[PDB]
Amino acid sequence: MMKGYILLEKVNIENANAFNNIIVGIPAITSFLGFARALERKLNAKEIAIRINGVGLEFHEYELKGYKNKRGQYVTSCPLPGSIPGQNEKKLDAHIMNQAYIDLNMSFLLEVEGPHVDMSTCKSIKSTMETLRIAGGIIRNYKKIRLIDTLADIPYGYFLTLRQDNLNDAAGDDMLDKMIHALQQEDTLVPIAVGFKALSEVGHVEGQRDPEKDHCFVESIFSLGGFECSKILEDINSCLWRYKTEEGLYLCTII
Amino acid sequence: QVFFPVGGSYHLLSILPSTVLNYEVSDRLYRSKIPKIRLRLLSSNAAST
RNA sequence: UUUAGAAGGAUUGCCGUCAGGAAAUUAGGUGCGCUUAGCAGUGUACCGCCGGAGGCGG
DNA sequence: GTGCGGA
DNA sequence: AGCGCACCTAATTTCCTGACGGCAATCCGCAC
């Protein structure tokens, strides 16, 4: 075919990152699209031409590593540090930095467009989803990889959508006051990270991961989001995240 | 350092965290009733470094 | 090609002694359940016969 | 291998 | 089948302990 939709159903991830400098919780959206782009790059070296241009994120259960106190607050845990490269590397006790970890069960909805979208493509995805990670976390098991046609085959769960209107339209002098007041009015919204902004100009520095590409120093940007059930969803395009790149801005938006 | 797709190719992005925003969020959440988590992981000698 | 890549929290323990819940009460008046109908797969699987398990007569 | 500097 | 009430109301008082104590260890890069 050409266009199509593939479901990755009930994926268990253990130990994914949950810290983005102001937020402890759901991982950033860039990692969830990075899983899809890594799946595309490994499928295109096995000579199965495909292109993923949209991801849907459905949440079925979660757990945060730690415990909940009597007062109702969350205290997080960390693994014991081992040996970290640097000056104090031959010592027996290392240092403790800032970290958080989460466990998730999720289902992914991928929009693929290639020369052939059949069940052999689903088998090729099944033989490739056992070498990748999701957000720095290992994949323990999955149920099935299948093709969907309509909005009645999608299992029960809750999707994550972008709500930027409820932020730009609230009361306050600055954006952080807008976020705090918008979270006090509606109590079903969460703050999320949605990409990066630029702090420098494109060039070549010294000390890069890949020394033959273009670099730019960046800072993360944050927004608002909320949850909507599968049975109350209108279209299958109002839950699909995509990459968008302006000049100086690296974003993920549903639009 | 991470890679980001820009138009058929990729760009390498190195992320620097914000200190001024962290101070600002922690003061404004101290007198609010929205959900919050306190992270207790750095020592005095680590913060000085 | 994912704020990428890495990680042993661990050993030990005496919560205890005492105690009066208690006095009073008005749940009450009404009420149309009601049309229709065939219980069984045959109602059981009986005498023998060859023949070292598998068969055949009435 | 030493001591340092602050919250 | 096709239904499954209308009205009102749910008391008052006097209190709710004195003592002691709540761990030791380890988590710092860097100039010189």
Side-chain angles (χ1 to χ4, degrees), chain A residues 2 4-50 52-69 71-90 93-118 120-122 124-143 145-243 245-254:
Chain A
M2 208 83 184
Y5 290 120
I6 307 181
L7 187 78
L8 309 183
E9 198 169 29
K10 316 246 172 143
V11 184
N12 278 343
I13 320 150
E14 284 189 10
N15 291 352
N17 196 358
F19 186 58
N20 268 86
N21 198 12
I22 78 155
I23 273 174
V24 176
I26 309 171
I29 306 291
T30 309
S31 67
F32 298 102
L33 280 66
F35 170 48
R37 196 81 163 199
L39 192 45
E40 182 179 3
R41 290 174 39 89
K42 302 199 127 143
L43 277 176
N44 279 342
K46 281 159 55 143
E47 286 169 8
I48 297 69
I50 203 173
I52 310 176
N53 36 15
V55 202
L57 315 170
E58 189 165 14
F59 296 74
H60 312 66
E61 74 209 343
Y62 79 90
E63 201 189 1
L64 198 63
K65 294 318 200 33
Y67 64 90
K68 196 149 37 45
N69 64 16
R71 313 170 185 176
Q73 301 206 13
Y74 273 92
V75 177
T76 56
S77 62
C78 71
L80 178 61
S83 177
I84 303 183
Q87 199 144 339
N88 279 303
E89 165 189 17
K90 302 150 118 303
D93 286 356
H95 63 81
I96 306 182
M97 299 280 116
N98 279 3
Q99 41 199 350
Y101 305 93
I102 198 169
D103 289 345
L104 306 152
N105 193 289
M106 277 189 314
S107 295
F108 303 79
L109 199 89
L110 312 167
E111 177 181 343
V112 317
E113 325 186 357
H116 313 273
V117 184
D118 37 23
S120 190
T121 300
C122 279
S124 296
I125 297 184
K126 190 183 306 179
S127 301
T128 314
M129 225 198 60
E130 272 207 341
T131 49
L132 297 165
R133 294 190 193 185
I134 305 177
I138 39 154
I139 305 165
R140 184 170 58 177
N141 55 3
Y142 44 97
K143 239 183 73 153
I145 294 123
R146 73 191 197 187
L147 289 92
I148 75 154
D149 299 348
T150 181
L151 259 168
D153 306 5
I154 289 182
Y156 181 59
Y158 290 66
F159 285 78
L160 193 61
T161 60
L162 184 41
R163 312 217 189 280
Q164 50 183 358
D165 293 340
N166 301 19
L167 182 57
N168 296 14
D169 304 345
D173 186 18
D174 59 354
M175 272 276 183
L176 188 45
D177 265 342
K178 288 222 208 153
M179 188 153 338
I180 301 187
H181 289 298
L183 276 150
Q184 299 175 353
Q185 301 171 1
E186 208 151 0
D187 302 358
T188 66
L189 289 197
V190 311
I192 67 173
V194 297
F196 307 107
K197 225 183 91 63
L199 299 168
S200 152
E201 272 291 348
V202 174
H204 186 240
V205 292
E206 214 180 329
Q208 306 182 176
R209 198 172 160 184
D210 203 344
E212 293 148 336
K213 288 191 154 53
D214 302 28
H215 181 92
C216 184
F217 290 85
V218 295
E219 151 199 25
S220 302
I221 64 182
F222 309 85
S223 185
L224 248 58
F227 296 83
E228 177 173 359
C229 300
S230 303
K231 323 177 332 201
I232 270 75
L233 200 63
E234 329 83 8
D235 215 350
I236 194 183
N237 168 325
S238 61
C239 72
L240 284 203
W241 296 81
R242 272 141 175 160
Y243 272 146
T245 60
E246 295 54 7
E247 269 209 29
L249 195 87
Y250 305 90
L251 256 58
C252 291
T253 56
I254 294 185

Side-chain angles (χ1 to χ4, degrees), chain B residues 1-30 32 34-49:
Chain B
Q1 338 185 47
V2 296
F3 288 97
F4 195 100
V6 153
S9 58
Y10 303 87
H11 268 183
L12 186 60
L13 307 178
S14 278
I15 316 169
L16 295 177
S18 174
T19 298
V20 289
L21 187 32
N22 203 0
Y23 206 80
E24 178 180 352
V25 173
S26 188
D27 303 359
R28 296 185 171 177
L29 281 170
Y30 187 40
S32 178
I34 54 184
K36 33 158 145 163
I37 295 182
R38 191 168 188 186
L39 289 183
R40 263 161 299 221
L41 296 173
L42 276 190
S43 65
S44 296
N45 289 154
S48 308
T49 316

